[PDB]
Amino acid sequence: ANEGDVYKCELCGQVVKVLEEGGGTLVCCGEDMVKQ
Amino acid sequence: ANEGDVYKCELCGQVVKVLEEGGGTLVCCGEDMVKQ
Ligand SMILES: [Hg+2]
Ligand SMILES: [Hg+2]
Fold first, then answer.
1. Of A13, A20, A28, the CB nearest to B27
2. What backbone torsions phi and psi does residue A19 show, to the nearest 5 degrees?
3. Cβ within 8 Å, pair B14-A22
4. CA-CA distance, A7 to B3, in Å (whole number)?
5. Start-to-end Cα distance in chain A
6. Which of A3, A27, B12, B31 has a beta carbon 3.0–4.6 Å from B27's, enabling a disulfide?
7. Domains of chain B with CATH codes
8. B15 Cβ partners below 8 Å, 6+ apart?
9. How far apart are CA B9 and CA A31, in angstroms?
């Protein structure tokens, strides 16, 4: 995921912003977070 | 996790900031992200 991108977890509504780019896929509540 | 908290994944170094608080645990590269 890229720096600055925002991801949301549709199961609990937690939203996070990427500060440092990395190669792994963001997961929350066992499900892939959705890129906003 | 709380709003404003910063999480890092030790396996790929991706860092994210919590914009909206949620009850799920943040995961990346299959592992729990570490609270900074
Ligand atoms: Hg990761
Ligand atoms: Hg979640």
1. A28
2. -90, -40
3. yes
4. 14
5. 12
6. A27
7. 6-35 (2.20.28)
8. A18, A19, A20, A22, B6, B7, B8, B9, B36
9. 16
